[PDB]
Amino acid sequence: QDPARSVRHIAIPAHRGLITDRNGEPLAVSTPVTTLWANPKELMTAKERWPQLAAALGQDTKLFADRIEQNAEREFIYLVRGLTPEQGEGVIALKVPGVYSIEEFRRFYPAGEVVAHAVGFTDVDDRGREGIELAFDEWLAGVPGKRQVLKDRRGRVIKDVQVTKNAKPGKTLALSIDLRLQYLAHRELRNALLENGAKAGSLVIMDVKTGEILAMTNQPTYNPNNRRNLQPAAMRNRAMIDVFEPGSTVKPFSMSAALASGRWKPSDIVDVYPGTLQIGRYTIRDVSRNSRQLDLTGILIKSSNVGISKIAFDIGAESIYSVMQQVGLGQDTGLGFPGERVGNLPNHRKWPKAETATLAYGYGLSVTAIQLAHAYAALANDGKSVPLSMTRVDRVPDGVQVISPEVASTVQGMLQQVVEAQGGVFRAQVPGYHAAGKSGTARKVSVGTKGYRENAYRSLFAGFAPATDPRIAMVVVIDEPSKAGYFGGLVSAPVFSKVMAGALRLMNVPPDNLPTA
Ligand SMILES: CCN1CCN(C(=O)N[C@@H](C(=O)N[C@H](C=O)[C@@H]2N[C@@H](C(=O)O)C(C)(C)S2)c2ccccc2)C(=O)C1=O
């Protein structure tokens, strides 16, 4: 019986889709590689050639021979996967009986570490396993072909009969990322980390009008063309996977809920004296504690937790929750990246006072940098939230009006004062332009359950520009800066400034800090 001849089929590997940036610059490119395999049965008839073959494969001669001897019953084994076709011709030129070639693909990432987290990485079988390569793996993968052959009883192909199914190439994908901005962000976030002795950071830039992520960088990063180091922490796309309490950066949302309530206008006053406010066993405290009456703008400039808490008590937590929820804090982004973290927005039927206050000033909720950026985008886009995209958006979908345009425009103006006013976040200023935003500084949560860390902080800045017709929103998060100056306004705001200055000019956005006509 057995099988004198035997009809078998083999997979024809499909070319993986090119990934570009939004201008067509290549970011992931399928590279023809040569994979060498062998038929041990056929090898058994040319043992005299093995030691030269082992040498060519950088293998110990005995270990190589042991490997073939032990796999002698098999008909297929890899010798080496993915060599350059030039390396592959070297071994093919030995002309060893039983040694054969297949054309595979392997990705090359021309921008390397600069866009590694966003673009991602493929596994040994050319499948996506992080970032866009994973999120769009079915678009990018195409469909393998099917080639029909005849094989003898000891595994040797006797002829190519025909292609029963043609391989179908995967399709091109243009990201929303602009590599010019991505490089600028990458460089300035790296510099800031190093300058501050920080442990990690993220920086997201978004188009407020289109929902597009124009830049997304994290430190530490890695070189996805280096398939050896296997360093899982440097591979974390922190902007999408590492949640944090946003702190004072959510106060503009609390204020939006205050203005929409009917009960508050920007010139109304809150008494924040003496810088603390006792709520049962918890004490709300401000960092700076030499104020009494502050107007709502001043509450933001001084970043008074006490002031925002008194407003929260007056309007109720439900209104604040609703704004936060509607702008996307702790909510699914829709981006469909496996392993993206949603974080958490807490909810109550009856909010207690402490939960009410801490929510209003940014504790007891966990967000991602992408969420935070999208929320600022909505605010900047006169209160309209356009769906987030990591792919280039040619036709913009309808956004959802999540904050009224009048309230969002009032809040814009207040954030411009936060940047421009005396005692504000002057380091976030963008020469030539009107910029707007909000600093934060949060103690990190302690890892052994419990409470909060004494000496360890996260520094934040979130903002947009130009104030008079916003185009770009940005979030800068730096984890555990190490110098005496650790506040968001010191550490993160100058990154915002430098990156907004370049980004606006790369986008040919006209300077708006002009005379009055
Ligand atoms: C829920 C308990 N729990 C947890 C942690 N926690 C907290 O980490 N507090 C920080 C805070 O108050 N941050 C505010 C908004 O971020 C203000 N804005 C900063 C900014 O603008 O950079 C600021 C000007 C430095 S103070 C803080 C404290 C100390 C130093 C710096 C910042 C609380 O307060 C708090 O009760």
Side-chain angles (χ1 to χ4, degrees), residues 248 282 287 303 305 358 361 363 438-443 452 487-488:
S248 303
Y282 176 58
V287 169
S303 216
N305 300 328
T358 55
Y361 60 91
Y363 306 107
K438 182 71 194 80
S439 64
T441 308
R443 293 182 183 174
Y452 282 90
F487 290 179

Side-chain angles (χ1 to χ4, degrees), residues 245-249 251 282-288 300-305 358 361 363-364 425 438-444 452 457 460 486-490:
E245 290 188 309
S248 303
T249 66
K251 292 176 175 173
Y282 176 58
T283 306
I284 302 162
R285 306 188 172 86
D286 289 349
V287 169
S288 188
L300 297 180
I301 295 161
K302 300 302 198 62
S303 216
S304 172
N305 300 328
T358 55
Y361 60 91
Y363 306 107
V425 189
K438 182 71 194 80
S439 64
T441 308
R443 293 182 183 174
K444 295 182 60 173
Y452 282 90
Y457 304 93
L460 304 95
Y486 59 86
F487 290 179
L490 295 174

Side-chain angles (χ1 to χ4, degrees), residues 286-300:
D286 289 349
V287 169
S288 188
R289 299 187 198 169
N290 283 180
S291 293
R292 171 163 281 142
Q293 286 183 5
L294 292 176
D295 68 19
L296 302 202
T297 306
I299 282 166
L300 297 180

Side-chain angles (χ1 to χ4, degrees), residues 244-314:
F244 57 85
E245 290 188 309
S248 303
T249 66
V250 297
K251 292 176 175 173
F253 303 109
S254 311
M255 194 67 69
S256 304
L259 301 169
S261 62
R263 307 181 49 83
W264 292 90
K265 54 176 175 48
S267 64
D268 286 335
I269 292 298
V270 184
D271 181 347
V272 305
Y273 176 86
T276 57
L277 176 58
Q278 193 63 20
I279 303 298
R281 79 173 73 81
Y282 176 58
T283 306
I284 302 162
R285 306 188 172 86
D286 289 349
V287 169
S288 188
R289 299 187 198 169
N290 283 180
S291 293
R292 171 163 281 142
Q293 286 183 5
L294 292 176
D295 68 19
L296 302 202
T297 306
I299 282 166
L300 297 180
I301 295 161
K302 300 302 198 62
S303 216
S304 172
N305 300 328
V306 171
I308 191 66
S309 304
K310 302 192 168 187
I311 293 169
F313 301 152
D314 177 80

Side-chain angles (χ1 to χ4, degrees), residues 101-121:
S101 203
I102 57 191
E103 251 298 317
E104 280 191 318
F105 300 95
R106 300 288 182 268
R107 287 291 228 193
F108 178 66
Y109 293 110
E113 68 177 2
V114 177
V115 69
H117 290 121
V119 168
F121 183 69

